[PDB]
Structure 1
Amino acid sequence: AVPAPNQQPEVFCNQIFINNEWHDAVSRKTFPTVNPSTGEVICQVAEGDKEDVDKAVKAARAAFQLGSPWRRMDASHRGRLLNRLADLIERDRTYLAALETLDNGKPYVISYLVDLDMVLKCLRYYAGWADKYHGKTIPIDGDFFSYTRHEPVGVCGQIIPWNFPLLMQAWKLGPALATGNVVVMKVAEQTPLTALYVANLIKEAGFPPGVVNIVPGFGPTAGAAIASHEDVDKVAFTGSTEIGRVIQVAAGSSNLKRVTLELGGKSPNIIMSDADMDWAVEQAHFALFFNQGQCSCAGSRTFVQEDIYDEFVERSVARAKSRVVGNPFDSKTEQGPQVDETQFKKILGYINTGKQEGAKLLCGGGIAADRGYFIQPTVFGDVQDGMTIAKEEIFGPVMQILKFKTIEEVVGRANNSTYGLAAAVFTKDLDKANYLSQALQAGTVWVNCYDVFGAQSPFGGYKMSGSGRELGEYGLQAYTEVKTVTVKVPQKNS
């Protein structure tokens, strides 16, 4: 059951969060955040820039000083704090879910049952990790006692996208705080509202001032400021491949800070002939159309074996046509609008390119409403590897269906991409599943399912889809700095 939402939730936070206090931009400037469903302005938000970032970094650094409350706090207590924050978010679940939908555009039902649930599960998972990421006692040669201390990396700059505002915030804060680090987060200008409210809950939870600092603003301004800052130890980024390069170069040009990236993808979703038709079709649909198709791991390349291609396509087109697009607050809506005008136009452009290049338009292909940024569920058939829609990340409700013959063939074609975030295999055969799951060059390989995220399992990309992993135990590596301590002893014994 989903509690009825408030289609016009009030905004309580719209400024820069530093030292557990709300601040206006030093420039006093503000930027508008739009409701993609109506195209109307929700409210103004403080436009942070370099000077605001510097204030945030200094606060975080101060909070990270040896002997500070955050540093002296027991590891188990950091966990207690993460749990408390989770409880606070759950208490305000209905509000946050609605506010998320208002600013992002995704269906309210989805924000409540999926986004918010996963946010709670992520924070509670890492809460448990706070006092369990042990260091090591090493049996080094000679008369010595050698061991490693797993210390926090320090001031962590976290730049997140807009597709999953609350979840992205959770995926970043969870591991960072669990390991005792301090954060300076730059949320997307398109969806800053929800993140800012959570900061209020972070203060309420009892987190010391400066531990978490949020700076809303634009990328080239606030974002680049964090990436090039001389006092930021680590930077985590999730977004476009283009900016990924900028972040890495900025890090190498500044203080050589640690970097980890997650930069979209063109994930192949292979459907073998022996696959369960009904299931494969529904999952393939979900694989691509999920969250308005705005998922880095979306199945944007649906490979289907020739013997079942025709039927699969027929069913897929039917499922796409039946996909209800409309007001995200209406319980019957399956697909809301795209996040903004920029994306809206970009997707329409890709659709145009698909038609131009010879791909077969089977359904949709145009705007689905006069107001807002709605696009019809579009499906392209007989797509070839060389086509643009088959190589570039659309990030919209545009499905590409390709045909293939042999398993050896699909392996090469699926791996022939600079991306490698995820992939899937639908088959009933044990050997095929193992052959493909091993052969596919991707961070995550789903078998007979898709978009199955668990705070316990790591997520990250191969090749140009990024580096490093998020979630699970692996998610703690990037937020940990290893220190070896080798002490001379009188006489070492086993």
Structure 2
Amino acid sequence: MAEQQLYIHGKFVAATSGKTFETINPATGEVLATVQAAGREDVDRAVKSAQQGQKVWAAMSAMARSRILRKAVDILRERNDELARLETLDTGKPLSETAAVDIVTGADVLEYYAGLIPALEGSQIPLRDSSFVYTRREPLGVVAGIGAWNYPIQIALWKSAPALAAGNAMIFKPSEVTPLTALKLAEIYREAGLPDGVFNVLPGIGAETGQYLTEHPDIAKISFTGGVASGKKVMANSAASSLKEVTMELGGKSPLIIAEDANLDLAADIAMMANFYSSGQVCTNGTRVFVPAKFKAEFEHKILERVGRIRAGDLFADDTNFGPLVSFPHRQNVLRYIESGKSEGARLLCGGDVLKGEGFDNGAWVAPTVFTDCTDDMTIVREEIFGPVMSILSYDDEAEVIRRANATEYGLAAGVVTPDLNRAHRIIHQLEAGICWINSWGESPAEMPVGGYKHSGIGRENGVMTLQSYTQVKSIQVEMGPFQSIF
């Protein structure tokens, strides 16, 4: 394709860095496009543009903002198939996923927040007959989002929707792995009537462009999605440079707890969806599957049956439901984890190699992989792989499985499979995770706040509360009585 540019103040503009990078189609190894990289001057230009756009945007009525975001939704729906194809080329996720999830649920969140703008309200507190307090929920101003590569456009929508709905301008940095759909979104927003500067997109390298965003003194908040290690670097710099509010959605090693009374067909289906969707590149994946020892062998058989139905192939084919990983460097990291599982004694139930033959030799494929006989000290059990690698762990009692599920620095998601009323709520209330599913996995409604305990995040996305977290409270006291000085 054409050499992709930055998007600043409602037009494509050349980067003033003189630097570029390439994004690879993970199914072929070919270069998709050359992308310009925003430097320090590009960030300052984006910020000044955002400051000018934010004032226009905040001065509109709440319903005027609502209508513009809803027009963007209508465009996204109409262009769902077009945007999904570009997403498939950039990420390697099958079209069967991208046309059905990536833009649909991105738009859903934009649609949800568009409707809530008129309900964003402050408070009023009487103190006494002669004084009262009222609060305003004011825009932060200019905020920055740093996106991840697994759900490029959805992440762009989940960050920009609450930010814009709260009256801010956002500067969005997509992942260097997958920058292309973020730039389409910027065009769609302008077409919908978003004022220039309110959504600027700055492709680049995280070591450079992201750092320049976190360091800029006129950016009031950073929202980051990525791996735990990368988050720790981002969060520090947003302190050492200028005091920014922060939200982080990091990785996890989420547990899936199968109870003794669970149906094993349901449990196996839930476990399949918790591990192999998007080729296992999902932060909320239930990679640690805890199963009663009494049912281990049966559950293993049901997992192997379902793994055999997985259909890798042409990513634009209707029946394809498994794709390559996002890049060859990521595959190398995933294969190193698979080899550490072999060396540490875990039993390889299936997969564990790359895929071979016509149409796979040129892609970044890893076969769906399952380890069993896993113990809590193994590398594959303690660390996030971010690939299609399920770990099966046997357990004996409910107290044990709760301790083991919680004995981690990760805290993102968790789930339980049981038909019993008391067991479902009782187990879930004791798990240390922000996103808990009972008898399901992966559904993430716009209404539902999501985010991590412990090392898996700071703050939340989605829900009414995330709209509020993109505002800052101003408290105003009206003193109508006589003021008394003691001097």
Q: Same fold (TM over 0.5)?
A: yes
- 8 Å Cα contact 2:270/2:441 also seen in 1: yes
Deviations 1:412-460 (A, max 9, x none): 0000000000000000111111111100000011000000110010000
After superposition, residues 292-331 of structure 1 pair within 5 angstroms as 292-331=279-318
Q: Secondary structure at the match of 2:352?
A: coil
Deviations 1:127-148 (A, max 9, x none): 0111112111113356212111
Query: Does residue 16 of structure 1 match 2:3?
Result: no
Query: Does residue 429 of structure 1 match 2:412?
Result: no
Partners of 1:224 and 1:140 lie apart in 2 by 45
Deviations 1:340-369 (A, max 9, x none): 111110101100000000100011110013
User: Match of 2:330, as an amino acid?
Assistant: Q
Query: Does residue 44 of structure 1 match 2:3?
Result: no
Partners of 1:93 and 1:289 lie apart in 2 by 23
Q: CA RMSD in A?
A: 1.3
- 8 Å Cα contact 2:3/2:33 also seen in 1: no
User: Match of 1:483, as an amino acid?
Assistant: K
Shift of 1:321: 2.6
Partners of 1:403 and 1:27 lie apart in 2 by 53
Match of 1:379 in 2: 370
- 8 Å Cα contact 2:223/2:247 also seen in 1: yes
Partners of 2:372 and 2:203 lie apart in 1 by 41
Shift of 1:276: 1.7
User: Match of 1:86, as an amino acid?
Assistant: V
Match of 1:178 in 2: 165
Deviations 1:267-320 (A, max 9, x none): 000001111211110111110111110111000100001121110111112211
Deviations 1:142-167 (A, max 9, x none): 62121110011111011010000110
Partners of 1:141 and 1:401 lie apart in 2 by 62
Match of 2:68 in 1: 81
Partners of 1:318 and 1:336 lie apart in 2 by 19
Partners of 1:241 and 1:351 lie apart in 2 by 20
* CA separation of 1:142 and 1:391: change in aligned 2, threshold 3 A: farther
- 8 Å Cα contact 1:303/1:401 also seen in 2: yes
Query: Does residue 57 of structure 1 match 2:47?
Result: yes
User: Match of 1:488, as an amino acid?
Assistant: E
After superposition, residues 343-422 of structure 1 pair within 5 angstroms as 343-368=330-355, 369-422=360-413
Partners of 1:234 and 1:175 lie apart in 2 by 13
Partners of 1:428 and 1:405 lie apart in 2 by 18
Query: Does residue 33 of structure 1 match 2:20?
Result: no
Shift of 1:47: 1.4
Partners of 1:322 and 1:230 lie apart in 2 by 52
Deviates more, 1:459-468 or 1:107-116: 107-116
Match of 1:4 in 2: none
Query: Does residue 333 of structure 1 match 2:323?
Result: no
Match of 2:222 in 1: 235
- 8 Å Cα contact 1:199/1:214 also seen in 2: yes
Partners of 1:294 and 1:474 lie apart in 2 by 27
After superposition, residues 87-166 of structure 1 pair within 5 angstroms as 87-141=74-128, 143-166=130-153
- 8 Å Cα contact 1:321/1:363 also seen in 2: no
User: Match of 2:106, as an amino acid?
Assistant: V
User: Match of 2:171, as an amino acid?
Assistant: V
Q: Secondary structure at the match of 2:274?
A: helix
- 8 Å Cα contact 1:321/1:364 also seen in 2: no
Partners of 2:239 and 2:319 lie apart in 1 by 49
User: Match of 2:25, as an amino acid?
Assistant: N
Deviations 1:465-493 (A, max 9, x none): 011010011211321100011102369xx
Match of 1:7 in 2: none
Partners of 2:281 and 2:129 lie apart in 1 by 56
- 8 Å Cα contact 2:268/2:299 also seen in 1: yes
- 8 Å Cα contact 2:3/2:36 also seen in 1: no
User: Match of 1:445, as an amino acid?
Assistant: C
Equivalent residue pairs, number: 478
- Identity score, percent: 43
Q: Secondary structure at the match of 1:361?
A: strand
TM-score between the two structures when normalised by the length of structure 2 = 0.96
**Unpaired runs of at least 5, structure 1:** 1-10
Q: Secondary structure at the match of 2:463?
A: coil
**Unpaired runs of at least 5, structure 2:** 483-487
User: Match of 1:440, as an amino acid?
Assistant: L
Match of 2:485 in 1: none
User: Match of 1:474, as an amino acid?
Assistant: M
Deviates more, 1:284-293 or 1:138-147: 138-147
Deviates more, 1:18-27 or 1:132-141: 132-141
Match of 1:3 in 2: none
Shift of 1:12: 6.8
User: Match of 1:427, as an amino acid?
Assistant: T
Point out 4+ residue stretches in structure 1 off by more than 3 angstroms: none
Shift of 1:377: 0.4
- 8 Å Cα contact 2:163/2:169 also seen in 1: yes
TM-score between the two structures when normalised by the length of structure 1 = 0.95
Shift of 1:13: 7.9
After superposition, residues 164-243 of structure 1 pair within 5 angstroms as 164-243=151-230
User: Match of 1:406, as an amino acid?
Assistant: D
Partners of 1:321 and 1:343 lie apart in 2 by 24
Deviates more, 1:448-457 or 1:138-147: 138-147
Partners of 2:230 and 2:51 lie apart in 1 by 26
- 8 Å Cα contact 1:13/1:197 also seen in 2: no
